[PDB]
Ligand binder design. Structure first.
Ligand code: FE2
Ligand code: FE2
Ligand code: FE2
Ligand code: FE2
Lengths: 334, 325
């Protein structure tokens, strides 16, 4: 671990229980008011169930393979949810000590996980009914991914975990948002509504974790700045970066290329998230830092300009697109 | 309040079992390429007979009574709260997954065990969806409530208690799905009977692994493991989904448990059967190297089956569209 949390910082999180209840918990959507996968699937209690399923298969029959790979990979990432609640519960002090702790930090993690459980569920059933993808190869991919876990480099530090999740929540909101807009272009409005509804959930989660880091910047500007530098040096990795389907050892890299080729969370948008978080957290305006925090502040604020220069060179000399087989789509070359 | 936390010096026991765990516990995992998947038991959506396979599924499930549906749904909802269970395993001291992808054998098992668990709720959820016999939205509300509530089995972050609890509950879930499969076969629903029986076989592998872990703990630390067994049995082995509710019935778990036990699915008699099996399986009455405290704990645990033998309403369910079960 390169950046473990100092033990005395426990007093910061232990003093925020009342603040967390008033400011972070309201970002949760009440269960009785929340959408469920049933709302977007054919009604199995209706006499027209078979007709509704057939209409689903017709509207999905024209989805190209490259969109299917991008959609499946995002769903596979969502389906590895048990790894994500475990990751949140690796953070010191704020983790769920008993599995049902009434502390506000643990109440959020369980309720956040409960909201997350519906995201992979709706797309999985939708893709199952579509018949357009090899569900067994996808289910093997999910089993491999959960067994592999993830390594975001958070070092059991809630500072790093909340910064990482703030980054990935916006990334996942952009991803599901782009997946819905691409579905809309292909005439598939229901899946567009599904992806847009999932994206709206991620925006609420983004605002909550972003508010947590904002509070940490207020109470500990030095610690949070050093944590932000450490996460950006490690880079924000996608939680499903160890995915493989038992056929392609480089499944994640190949899926990522297809997803970014379609405009779903490109490298340019990775930099857009950093610029937004810099402006939202006011990283360039934080005062009262020491020399170590000042170097971290200058490092983070200098990253956007360096990233744009890499993107300009990639715009002129881009690598040729390679097409590779995907077991998700029955081994066809995508 | 933790009543039985693990002594810090017990860490050396688990740290000495990394090689033993790889050689003896990890082989209980089923390789992914050899593992069944929900697709194997569901209508093939890539086939031309997809609609016919779905309709045949609905025909076999059209006669399932409400009491069996409630028992089956409640077992599926328990399976769907999987993210709570991997967190529970990672609350144990020393043996938890510190980084989420740790190569330590204890963490390799936990992630792979969770991966196997993910298919159990998945197959029954999709099967019940296609059946059209149950209110899927009320079930999805129940799952969201359950994950948000979590669970508290009283393991006190103690791997001794966690492995004893899981050994107990793994057998309970294997028996539960076994009875659900036997009842499905009686009603002519053969496919679901194979599904519940295949899930039960997964739990038997998990039971044997955690049972093997506790057996090793009895060998290396008979006093500590005996004291842990007494503490868990005093706390009672609670079902992981004991905090379930559907936003309609605050007593959903008690009402679901009554329906499930009325049908013969993991009755109070079978709760005692698990204890008696674990007593004989672990050789609790013959364990060596005990002190005065462990012998007193041993006399309590081995006396419980006799105490349990002497100890041995219809309500609406939103799962079945509010009908009285
Ligand atoms: Fe999500
Ligand atoms: Fe999310
Ligand atoms: Fe299970
Ligand atoms: Fe199990």
């Amino acid at each position: 671990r390169t950046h473990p949390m100092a033990p005395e910082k426990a007093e910061i999180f232990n003093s925020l229980h009342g603040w967390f209840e008033d400011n972070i918990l309201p970002f949760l959507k009440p269960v009785e008011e929340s959408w469920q996968p049933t709302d977007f699937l054919p009604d199995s209690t209706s006499d027209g169930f078979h007709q509704q399923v057939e209409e689903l298969r017709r509207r999905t029959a024209e989805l190209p393979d490259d969109y299917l790979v991008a959609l499946v990979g995002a769903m596979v990432t969502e389906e590895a949810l048990p790894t994500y609640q475990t990751m949140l519960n690796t953070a010191d002090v704020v983790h769920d000590e008993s599995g049902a702790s009434p502390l506000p930090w643990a109440v959020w993690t369980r309720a956040w996980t409960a909201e997350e459980n519906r995201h992979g569920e709706i797309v999985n059933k939708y893709l199952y009914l579509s018949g357009r993808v090899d569900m067994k190869q996808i289910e093997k991919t999910i089993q491999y991914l959960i067994g592999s876990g993830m390594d975001p480099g958070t070092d059991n530090n809630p500072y790093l975990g909340f910064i990482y999740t703030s980054y990935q929540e916006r990334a996942t909101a952009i991803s599901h948002g782009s997946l819905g807009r691409l579905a809309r272009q292909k005439g598939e409005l229901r899946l567009a509504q599904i992806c847009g509804t999932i994206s709206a959930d991620e925006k609420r989660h983004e605002a909550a974790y972003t508010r947590i880091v904002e509070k940490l910047f207020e109470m500990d500007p030095e610690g949070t700045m050093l944590a932000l530098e450490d996460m950006m040096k490690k880079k924000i990795v996608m939680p499903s970066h160890l995915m493989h389907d038992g056929k392609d050892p480089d499944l994640f890299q190949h899926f990522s290329a297809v997803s970014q080729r379609l405009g779903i969370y490109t490298a340019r948008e990775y930099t857009d998230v950093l610029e937004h978080l810099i402006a939202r957290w006011g990283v360039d305006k934080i005062m009262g830092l020491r020399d170590e925090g000042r170097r971290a502040q200058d490092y983070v604020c200098g990253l956007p300009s360096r990233f744009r220069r890499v993107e300009e060179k990639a715009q002129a000399w881009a690598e040729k697109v390679s097409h590779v087989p995907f077991s998700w789509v029955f081994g066809r070359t995508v």
